[PDB]
Amino acid sequence: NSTATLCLGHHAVPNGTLVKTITDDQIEVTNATELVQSSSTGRICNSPHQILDGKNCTLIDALLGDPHCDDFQNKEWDLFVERSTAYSNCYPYYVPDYVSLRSLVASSGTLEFTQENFNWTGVAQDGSSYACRRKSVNSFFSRLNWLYNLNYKYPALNVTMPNNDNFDKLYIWGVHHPGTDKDQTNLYIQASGRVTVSTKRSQQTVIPNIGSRPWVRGVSSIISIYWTIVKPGDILLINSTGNLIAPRGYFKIQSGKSSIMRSDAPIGNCKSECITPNGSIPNDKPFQNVNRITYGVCPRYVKQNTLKLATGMRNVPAGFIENGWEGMVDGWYGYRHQNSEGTGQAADLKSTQAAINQITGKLNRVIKKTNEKFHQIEKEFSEVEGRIQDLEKYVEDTKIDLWSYNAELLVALENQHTIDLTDSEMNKLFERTRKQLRENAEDMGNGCFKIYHKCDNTCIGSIRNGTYDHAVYRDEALNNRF
Amino acid sequence: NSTATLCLGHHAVPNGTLVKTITDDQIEVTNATELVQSSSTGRICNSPHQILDGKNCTLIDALLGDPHCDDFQNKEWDLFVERSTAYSNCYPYYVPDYVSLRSLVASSGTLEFTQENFNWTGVAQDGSSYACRRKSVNSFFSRLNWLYNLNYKYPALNVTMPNNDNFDKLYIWGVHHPGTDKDQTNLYIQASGRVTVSTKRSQQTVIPNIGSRPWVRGVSSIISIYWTIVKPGDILLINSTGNLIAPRGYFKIQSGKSSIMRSDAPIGNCKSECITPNGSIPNDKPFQNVNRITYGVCPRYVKQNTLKLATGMRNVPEAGFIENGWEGMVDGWYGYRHQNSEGTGQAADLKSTQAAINQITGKLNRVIKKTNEKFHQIEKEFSEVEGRIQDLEKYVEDTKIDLWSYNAELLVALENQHTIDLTDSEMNKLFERTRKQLRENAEDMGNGCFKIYHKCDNTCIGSIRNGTYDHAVYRDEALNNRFQ
Amino acid sequence: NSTATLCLGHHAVPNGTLVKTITDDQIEVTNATELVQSSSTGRICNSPHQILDGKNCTLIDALLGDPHCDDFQNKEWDLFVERSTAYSNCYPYYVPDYVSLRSLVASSGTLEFTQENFNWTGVAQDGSSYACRRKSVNSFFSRLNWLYNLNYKYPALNVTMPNNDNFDKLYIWGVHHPGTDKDQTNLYIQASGRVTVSTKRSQQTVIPNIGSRPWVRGVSSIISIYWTIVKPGDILLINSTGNLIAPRGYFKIQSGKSSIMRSDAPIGNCKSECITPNGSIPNDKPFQNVNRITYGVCPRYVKQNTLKLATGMRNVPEIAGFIENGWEGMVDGWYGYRHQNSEGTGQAADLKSTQAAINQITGKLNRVIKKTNEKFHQIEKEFSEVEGRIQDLEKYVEDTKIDLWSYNAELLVALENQHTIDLTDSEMNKLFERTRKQLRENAEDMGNGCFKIYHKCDNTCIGSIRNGTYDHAVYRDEALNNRF
Ligand SMILES: *[C@@H]1O[C@H](CO)[C@@H](O[C@@H]2O[C@H](CO)[C@@H](O[C@@H]3O[C@H](CO)[C@@H](O)[C@H](O)[C@@H]3O)[C@H](O)[C@H]2NC(C)=O)[C@H](O)[C@H]1NC(C)=O
Ligand SMILES: *[C@@H]1O[C@H](CO)[C@@H](O[C@@H]2O[C@H](CO)[C@@H](O[C@@H]3O[C@H](CO)[C@@H](O)[C@H](O)[C@@H]3O)[C@H](O)[C@H]2NC(C)=O)[C@H](O)[C@H]1NC(C)=O
Ligand SMILES: *[C@@H]1O[C@H](CO)[C@@H](O[C@@H]2O[C@H](CO)[C@@H](O[C@@H]3O[C@H](CO)[C@@H](O)[C@H](O)[C@@H]3O)[C@H](O)[C@H]2NC(C)=O)[C@H](O)[C@H]1NC(C)=O
Ligand SMILES: *[C@@H]1O[C@H](CO)[C@@H](O[C@@H]2O[C@H](CO)[C@@H](O)[C@H](O)[C@H]2NC(C)=O)[C@H](O)[C@H]1NC(C)=O
Ligand SMILES: *[C@@H]1O[C@H](CO)[C@@H](O[C@@H]2O[C@H](CO)[C@@H](O)[C@H](O)[C@H]2NC(C)=O)[C@H](O)[C@H]1NC(C)=O
Ligand SMILES: *[C@@H]1O[C@H](CO)[C@@H](O[C@@H]2O[C@H](CO)[C@@H](O)[C@H](O)[C@H]2NC(C)=O)[C@H](O)[C@H]1NC(C)=O
Ligand SMILES: *[C@@H]1O[C@H](CO)[C@@H](O[C@@H]2O[C@H](CO)[C@@H](O)[C@H](O)[C@H]2NC(C)=O)[C@H](O)[C@H]1NC(C)=O
Ligand SMILES: *[C@@H]1O[C@H](CO)[C@@H](O)[C@H](O)[C@H]1NC(C)=O
Ligand SMILES: *[C@@H]1O[C@H](CO)[C@@H](O)[C@H](O)[C@H]1NC(C)=O
Ligand SMILES: *[C@@H]1O[C@H](CO)[C@@H](O)[C@H](O)[C@H]1NC(C)=O
Ligand SMILES: *[C@@H]1O[C@H](CO)[C@@H](O)[C@H](O)[C@H]1NC(C)=O
Ligand SMILES: *[C@@H]1O[C@H](CO)[C@@H](O)[C@H](O)[C@H]1NC(C)=O
Ligand SMILES: *[C@@H]1O[C@H](CO)[C@@H](O)[C@H](O)[C@H]1NC(C)=O
Ligand SMILES: *[C@@H]1O[C@H](CO)[C@@H](O)[C@H](O)[C@H]1NC(C)=O
Ligand SMILES: *[C@@H]1O[C@H](CO)[C@@H](O)[C@H](O)[C@H]1NC(C)=O
Structure with a gap:
């Protein structure tokens, strides 16, 4: 106590x-x-x-201009979302270095396209296919120009396009590989084509391959896709005697925080x-x-x-x-x-x-x-x-x-x-x-x-x-x- | 106290x-x-x-079928052990992207081969060479098929092979580069060959090179080795007008915990x-x-x-x-x-x-x-x-x-x-x-x-x-x- | 107290x-x-x-022998410093795998060149160009040898060069891509050339690409640059029917602590x-x-x-x-x-x-x-x-x-x-x-x-x-x- x-x-x-x-x-x-x-x-x-739902479209299909991907023209994104249900529905193609093209476009974050007046005199333009219908009509990739013979003649193309802007230009182009020689000579008059795309700092030459291929969407041919970057003050030179799938212009190629993601969410x-x-x-x-x-x-x-x-x-x-x-x-x-x-x-x-x-x-x-x-x-x-x-x-x-x-x-x-x-x-x-x-x-x-x-x-x-x-x-x- | x-x-x-x-x-x-x-x-x-001692055999030679590597046919491994004493004893070859082929085969962990009935009508098959003797007689890689002209004719080949299975198929094939023009036209009638191997998602074209090479095991020629993977529902399509070293079938390409190691232990x-x-x-x-x-x-x-x-x-x-x-x-x-x-x-x-x-x-x-x-x-x-x-x-x-x-x-x-x-x-x-x-x-x-x-x-x-x-x-x- | x-x-x-x-x-x-x-x-x-200031010369230009880089011949370094003001002033070229060539030479740390007497009988040598003036005279890369026809003839070259030394040899060579078909047939007689450089462990073949190019220093053509490493006891074999930009010798290729750095300091x-x-x-x-x-x-x-x-x-x-x-x-x-x-x-x-x-x-x-x-x-x-x-x-x-x-x-x-x-x-x-x-x-x-x-x-x-x-x-x- x-x-x-x-x-x-x-x-x-x-x-x-x-x-x-x-x-x-x-x-x-x-x-x-x-x-x-x-x-x-x-x-x-x-x-x-800024999310861009690719829906049924991959980025490369939106890049090339697959008709069911037309809504993606000139769109921008922070994150492009590719869905596993995406499919191709145009002319059959494959991209050597698909991974890198997909990566750098995804990182660029834009599909801003600018047409340029390439001078394709001597050849027919706007080649179309039943395998690439746009709004029920035979068509082709919106950003590519399928050149072919004009009145049974395919003169040698030698086209220039300078980069007089302050930015890099991304050019997507292709080479057509016909299924048969009958196809080859009917489209391009020469028995074998050749495409040379060059700048002051690069050279890319492709020899087309005539040969049978597994049928894809009613077509036994295929297109190889390539890309070329033209620095400011440089010059794009396209030199071809056949099978050239020509560009219609350039894409802006930016640097930033954009990317791509595969998701079904x-x-x-x-x-x-x-x-x-x-x-x-x-x-x-x-x-x-x-x-x-x-x-x-x-x-x-x-x-x-x-x-x-x-x-x-x-x-x-x-x-x-x-x-x-x-x-x-x-x-x-x-x-x-x-x-x-x-x-x-x-x-x-x-x-x-x-x-x-x-x-x-x-x-x-x-x-x-x-x-x-x-x-x-x-x-x-x-x-x-x-x-x-x-x-x-x-x-x-x-x-x-x-x-x-x-x-x-x-x-x-x-x-x-x-x-x-x-x-x-x-x-x-x-x-x-x-x-x-x-x-x-x-x-x-x-x-x-x-x-x-x-x-x-x-x-x-x-x-x-x-x-x-x-x-x-x-x-x-x-x-x-x- | x-x-x-x-x-x-x-x-x-x-x-x-x-x-x-x-x-x-x-x-x-x-x-x-x-x-x-x-x-x-x-x-x-x-x-x-599961250790597989490669002994005197590299994995790629066991893959192609070098005669002294015949014991490795269809074998599997967790770890393939390549010895520094391994040697090649078949036709001279080189593999563009040897590193990747070696890696993906090693990671697959098996050499299970499956023969397929390619239809090579029009050409001679099973070409043999003094540089690749098996049981003391002229022979060739066990998994490759040396095609050449049949009675002074080498028609253009257009052979298909669909993949109707649940797995990817690995096809190993080659292109022959003769030492001289006489060799080129005697073997394949055309003055210049061409090999195009394609799938629905790929195309591989090779132009052979007629020209001298450093003498190797009695041969002034060489073979280039390539590989093609065919996905399910896809189709292998082979087109050749000469110099094709054809496949005999496919290897299973599995995914698992297998690898390869260089060791002399x-x-x-x-x-x-x-x-x-x-x-x-x-x-x-x-x-x-x-x-x-x-x-x-x-x-x-x-x-x-x-x-x-x-x-x-x-x-x-x-x-x-x-x-x-x-x-x-x-x-x-x-x-x-x-x-x-x-x-x-x-x-x-x-x-x-x-x-x-x-x-x-x-x-x-x-x-x-x-x-x-x-x-x-x-x-x-x-x-x-x-x-x-x-x-x-x-x-x-x-x-x-x-x-x-x-x-x-x-x-x-x-x-x-x-x-x-x-x-x-x-x-x-x-x-x-x-x-x-x-x-x-x-x-x-x-x-x-x-x-x-x-x-x-x-x-x-x-x-x-x-x-x-x-x-x-x-x-x-x-x-x-x-x-x- | x-x-x-x-x-x-x-x-x-x-x-x-x-x-x-x-x-x-x-x-x-x-x-x-x-x-x-x-x-x-x-x-x-x-x-x-040991610092080597590249001045207005990149390492690759000093390697090939751009005339304004002549002072860099046979020089060695611990650190090569490339300045952002560097420029090329010889024949237009590009190096497939430029990054790797720059890397391996920079890691070697030396430009020691040793001339070797290749037998180029049948063709003209030492082709020069307005695009590559040296002392105000038309010239070419100091380490490369531009071969072309000799009095309307370009015989097939089959030139060998063994490595009888105890060290590896680095060979730099090129292939010329004329701007037009007539350029191709005027320089070399064949409508298409072919260059194959091979050793016992490697083969490199180049098909020249005829096509127009952006005008550079008076030239609408270009050269592709390639390299080949010849191990001791191996043999360099060069076979060409046109368009070969030949080597004049080899570079010593060392292993060590050398590198290259881009800096303007x-x-x-x-x-x-x-x-x-x-x-x-x-x-x-x-x-x-x-x-x-x-x-x-x-x-x-x-x-x-x-x-x-x-x-x-x-x-x-x-306190x-x-x-x-x-x-x-x-x-x-x-x-x-x-x-x-x-x-x-x-x-x-x-x-x-x-x-x-x-x-x-x-x-x-x-x-x-x-x-x-x-x-x-x-x-x-x-x-x-x-x-x-x-x-x-x-x-x-x-x-x-x-x-x-x-x-x-x-x-x-x-x-x-x-x-x-x-x-x-x-x-x-x-x-x-x-x-x-x-x-x-x-x-x-x-x-x-x-x-x-x-x-x-x-x-x-x-x-x-x-x-x-x-x-x-x-x-x-x-x-x-x-x-x-
Ligand atoms: C080389 O061999 C291949 C394979 O056999 C040949 O390709 C095949 O060509 C035929 C006719 O062009 C194709 O037929 C078509 O099949 C589709 C499939 O749905 C069908 O809808 C069409 O109505 C038509 O019947 C066949 O599909 C095609 N096979 C493959 C695997 O693509 C090729 O023609 C040969 N090259 C020649 C003969 O020059
Ligand atoms: C291009 O030049 C090369 C090298 O100068 C030539 O290769 C050489 O070809 C000869 C055969 O004509 C080889 O000689 C043979 O050697 C074996 C074993 O060494 C010997 O047993 C034979 O009796 C024969 O003498 C020589 O080894 C070979 N050298 C090399 C480095 O491969 C080649 O023939 C020339 N091309 C043409 C089309 O002439
Ligand atoms: C294919 O088309 C291209 C584009 O027109 C042609 O290239 C151009 O060729 C001309 C003539 O060689 C070059 O002009 C030169 O320019 C310099 C300085 O500017 C001047 O000093 C020369 O006297 C001459 O005017 C022009 O620069 C060049 N264009 C480019 C972009 O390089 C080429 O010649 C054509 N090729 C064929 C085979 O037709
Ligand atoms: C497989 O591909 C070859 C390569 O083109 C095809 O051969 C061509 O056939 C036409 C027919 O006249 C010729 O004009 C070409 O020159 C041929 N090529 C060569 C290299 O000669 C061959 O036809 C294809 N497959 C089939 C089944 O024909
Ligand atoms: C690049 O373009 C040039 C110029 O148009 C082509 O050169 C012409 O080619 C044709 C067919 O071979 C010849 O008949 C002409 O004489 C050539 N003209 C000149 C001025 O050389 C050349 O073929 C094209 N090259 C490629 C790879 O397509
Ligand atoms: C490799 O070199 C040989 C010569 O050593 C070349 O072969 C000659 O080629 C010409 C034309 O192609 C023929 O007229 C000769 O008859 C050939 N000689 C022999 C012995 O075959 C061959 O073209 C070269 N290959 C290349 C440069 O790729
Ligand atoms: C504060 O700390 C620094 C670093 O620990 C002390 O600097 C050291 O001083 C000793 C003197 O005995 C030198 O030998 C060391 O080289 C010094 N080290 C560095 C990193 O400078 C410094 O003395 C301290 N300052 C005070 C006031 O005690
Ligand atoms: C396009 O180029 C051709 C080349 O022959 C020339 O004739 C024509 O005038 C050019 N047209 C335009 C609009 O530049
Ligand atoms: C997330 O998705 C990945 C593959 O898409 C799956 O392996 C993982 O278990 C998932 N985790 C959760 C928490 O959903
Ligand atoms: C317990 O910790 C969590 C985590 O910081 C906190 O949110 C909570 O207020 C804490 N106190 C509780 C649960 O009483
Ligand atoms: C193989 O295919 C050819 C196609 O030319 C056909 O003529 C031949 O009968 C077939 N034979 C066999 C045994 O498959
Ligand atoms: C193990 O072997 C490697 C390769 O021969 C060698 O670099 C390393 O020093 C060796 N170390 C030991 C502990 O044996
Ligand atoms: C020392 O530590 C090791 C590891 O914990 C143990 O196994 C060992 O018995 C210890 N020795 C003594 C003498 O305590
Ligand atoms: C050089 O080549 C010519 C022609 O090929 C030959 O006659 C001559 O003997 C060769 N000289 C040497 C030293 O090899
Ligand atoms: C060093 O230079 C880089 C540019 O190459 C610059 O980003 C960085 O801030 C500089 N750091 C210092 C400490 O000057």
């Missing part, structure tokens, strides 16, 4: 979370947060990025910085497990499906040496007392705020939203290729393993640090109380002090308030101790 | 090991372990991976998950220094040859831990020494010993386990100058190794620092728990020992070590001795 | 530096150092690397291990923000422009101990005592704790990251032409590398600074505890980092505490009388 008990403690919860540290494989803490984004809504948000009316083929994902967490293919401001892809970051002290469901206090809801640390006036509880705001202030924004010190990716490498492959594809796969797998390691070590280190800093605040609160009490109390060993003098609620409050004067009670307290 | 001294201490060893921390360049600990695997047995274990009868060109290596350690070229579940290649991970506390060799550690303590990491009315004694503390040990066991397995399972990767050694693509392959690999070497360096320093800190922490916690027990009955002598101001025999000493010491029993006696 | 006050404290400075830790975005410390090199002199030091007379396009930079710091393109022993490129590494304790602006405040005015140590007794107040530094903290901070980062970054010929990292796939990969690899090293640098500085704060806070607490153990029952903790010593304790007595020789038993009777 002539003494008092003051216990120092911390809070506890009944439903703790296990996290991982350097010290413990699993340790239960009061609170944690997930660092790996692992789910997507399934929709690609049309804000803030629908485009929704929402706003999201990060786009994956699985759909848009939130970018609050530093890491994501949804897809290695991302566009925008995105969490970094890691192999882990979950990484829990401790946001509270160790959960331990007498003072803090024995146990935590589930009943303390207004603070992380606090006091419990037993004196002449009964029992009471009060939280310590100083130590609680110190622990919280260290834990808030903990992760914003090492990992921020510094991962803004636009056009990158391909990370999914449908064809066997070998060397270049091996390297692309190895680079991406090397990157992911390294960030997965970084993510693992970071969470373990930070969680070790969250435990230690919260353990530290508890000991500091205990030491502040001991130094206040001086020779008026003894450490009972369980996180509680035995105060050797009568100490009513105001006296206990003075200790919690930091205004306890040991000199006032030292005479009374030293008398009871010894 | 009658008092007792109780000292808190930790163990020490005479033969400590130097490790590195964040704090110290080198600090001696009681025990440490190596994290870098630096030696190999010298043998490639034939388990658990022998194949032994053992079990080992990790294979390097130097031989199999253990994969218990997280890092290895043997070879950046690995196959299987492997430690990560680092530039360091040794990384010692502390598995024990700081070593302070030979009362109380403030002064020194106790080599004489062999049954625990922490413990008590006392001097009382009954003499002197020593006893270890199980709680603090177990706390430190449990925190250290599996300490590195909390950050890096054997999640490094690699199979077919990029090439990492090169015998020829190539330029751009090889520059990139080298830069990629050197970037990876530097980053992992940095990771390994920082990890060991961090782990060792934390191992030091946690073991030192257990010592201070043990000393403090003892102080809390003694209350006003003892005083800190400053050297890790308490002066207990009352008679405290071995049972009393044991009660302190066991946590059952009641200070109130002796408080009256102790306070009388402390204060005069 | 029959008592004394002994305060334990640490120093403080008026001009602290903000650093970043795991705990705080900004915390002021007594001292810090910059880890990111962010500035350049603007000049490339001509030592210790001037070359100075100084010494610097690290070269960037912006100029030489010091390599004392582990990181640099100047340029991802480096040559030599260089700091690792990071995206950060500054990373400050704490080299001192927390700065706490200013009272360390609990309340730090001591501005302590200039001979990091930690120390302030005392107040009968003779007044005094201050003295503690050398043990000061040296302990300092020894732990010096070279702290060299324990984890040294100058293990020595790079020479690497990949290209800036691009003037659109290329697509391969350039996509080179950009992605470098961007991946920089982000990973930028992450490492950010985490390393935050970790190291947190540990520097913690180790210095610890040294302060250890000194305070060492003093508490010395005083025994003669003093009490006042809570502000100070002890109230309950006995008369002049300066010699205080010095004994600082010196570690204070005997508490001497004053215990006097002190206990005052406490209780």
